[PDB]
Design a protein around this nucleic acid. Structure first.
Ligand SMILES: *[C@@H](C)[C@@H](O)CCCOCCOC(=O)CCCC
Lengths: 214, 228
RNA sequence: GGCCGCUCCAGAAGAGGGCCCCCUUGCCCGUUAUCGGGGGCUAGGCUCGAUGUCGGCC
């Protein structure tokens, strides 16, 4: 019977200088056997805190940890630019050791609506037998957005995939692709291909669409 | 700065296959440590795999690798190993080797205090295949505030990675190359896009340069607007 | 009614075992290894013990 570690929120946005708190709940008591790790993209985790609140050697003192029952918190007292990263908690009260799923600390900026573009499949692709329809959401903030595909006004489900960039290194926005993949046969069964986008930066949902052929 | 862990042995294997990972340690003795393997599937969290105490030979394993994976250590080489048999697609991950320092004054092992750089393990039955590259063309319809969007759809390659540049690296501003998605076919796909001034479309040439080292492919695709 | 027992029956019977919580390991302890103390539960299901509503002897 393992002990689960549940981290919330999955991500949060903050600015340099903010006080940041990250929380993790053990499914049952782990006494005081919790560690916190920092991981940057493409890099190995580093130990920050062990035994709930003890700083590991060399870790800056703006990092601290505390416990309230099964709730464990990592606090960064004044967030520095090198602190944008993902943070993981882990218990070692009982084997097997288990990790929380992580909290990504991201850069806060002003709201930015996406610019939306839709791309029909190329004739090259159609000749090969497939039809990818691409909808682009460019340079928006915050990350949350809802992308809906409609084919002849019928809402699509299960036949699309999304991909989202990491925060731009220059302007801190996100960009996102949603790709609707039909067979050539299915794509020719319909006329209107529409991508509908909801985002905080938009007063009402934006729809880009095209008519097959035209 | 003296503690180092150097993983090797990762690679691409078919389901059912085997790999041996190595973790070469310096700056400390393996017999004064607990050595671990922890893996991280693409875009996911950390999953403990196996631990070993080279001093005692004691080992432990995640339930889902028991019988398949064997962790071992050669103290004469200060190296730990993970022998991985009966590999499957869900084992695809970066595998990190990590250390817990032994403290004779303590009474149990504590946290994972140092982690190596990681080695990538990919388990797939897919065959190596270069991408098909299709244009994402701008049309006169879709000009938003003096800005056009165009791109390249880089579809059905294996494995990772592909690199994409634009105009042989002369075009970098406004470029977004999205993370690849693993399609249900077992092949990868991604798009790279760029926004440019719409007035430029007649007098500028936009080419995406797609490189896929595993297939030794370099493909240049001119992306131009469709008219009428 | 006595004595000797637990082979059988009874649950009237309490330890083992198992789960949870507190104390930053906190008398002493601690397998290259997570303890100890305290608290909250679990009973007739296994082991051991005890008992008689049981068995044997007189
Ligand atoms: C043994 C000392 C302990 O069980 C007695 C305490 C009374 O609580 C209920 C009985 O405990 C059990 O359930 C034991 C089950 C073992 C198979």
């Amino acid at each position: 019977s393992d002990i689960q570690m549940t981290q919330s929120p999955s991500s949060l946005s903050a600015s340099v200088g903010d006080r940041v708190t990250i929380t993790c709940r053990a499914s049952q008591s782990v006494y005081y056997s919790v560690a916190w790790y920092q991981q940057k993209p493409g890099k190995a985790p580093k130990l920050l805190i062990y035994s709930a609140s003890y700083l590991y050697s060399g870790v800056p003192s703006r990092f601290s940890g505390s416990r309230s029952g099964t709730d464990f918190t990592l606090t960064i007292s004044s967030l520095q630019p090198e602190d944008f990263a993902t943070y993981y908690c882990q218990q070692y009260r009982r084997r097997p050791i288990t990790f929380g799923q992580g909290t990504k600390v991201e850069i806060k900026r002003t709201v930015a609506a996406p610019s939306v573009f839709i791309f029909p499949p190329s004739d090259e692709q159609l000749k090969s037998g497939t039809a990818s329809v691409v909808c682009l959401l460019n340079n928006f903030y915050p990350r949350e957005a809802k992308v809906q595909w409609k084919v002849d006004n019928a809402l699509q489900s299960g036949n699309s995939q999304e991909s989202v960039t990491e925060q731009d290194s220059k302007d801190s926005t996100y960009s996102l692709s949603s790709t609707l993949t039909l067979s050539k046969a299915d794509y020719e069964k319909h006329k209107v291909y529409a991508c509908e986008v909801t985002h905080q930066g938009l007063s009402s949902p934006v729809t880009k669409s095209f008519n097959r052929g035209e | 700065s003296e503690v180092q862990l150097v993983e090797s042995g990762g690679g691409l294997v078919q389901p059912g296959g085997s790999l041996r990972l190595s973790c070469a340690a310096s700056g400390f003795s393996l017999s004064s440590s607990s050595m671990h393997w922890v893996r991280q599937a693409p875009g996911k969290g950390l999953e403990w795999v196996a631990s070993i105490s080279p001093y005692s030979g004691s080992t432990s394993y995640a339930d889902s690798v028991k019988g398949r994976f064997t962790i071992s250590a050669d103290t004469s080489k200060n190296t730990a190993y993970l022998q991985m048999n009966s590999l499957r697609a869900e084992d695809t991950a970066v595998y990190y080797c990590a250390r817990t320092k032994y403290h004779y004054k303590n009474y149990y092992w504590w946290a994972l205090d140092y982690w190596g750089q990681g080695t990538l393990v990919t388990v797939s039955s897919a065959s190596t295949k270069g991408p098909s590259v299709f244009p994402l063309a701008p049309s006169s319809k879709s000009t938003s505030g003096g800005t056009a969007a165009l791109g390249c759809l880089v579809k059905d390659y294996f494995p990772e990675p592909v690199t994409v540049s634009w105009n042989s690296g002369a075009l970098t501003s406004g470029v977004h190359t999205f993370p690849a998605v693993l399609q249900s076919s077992g092949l990868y796909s991604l798009s790279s896009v760029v926004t440019v001034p719409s007035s430029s479309l007649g007098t500028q040439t936009y080419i995406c340069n797609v490189n896929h080292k595993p297939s030794n492919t370099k493909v240049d695709k001119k992306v131009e607007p469709k008219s009428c």
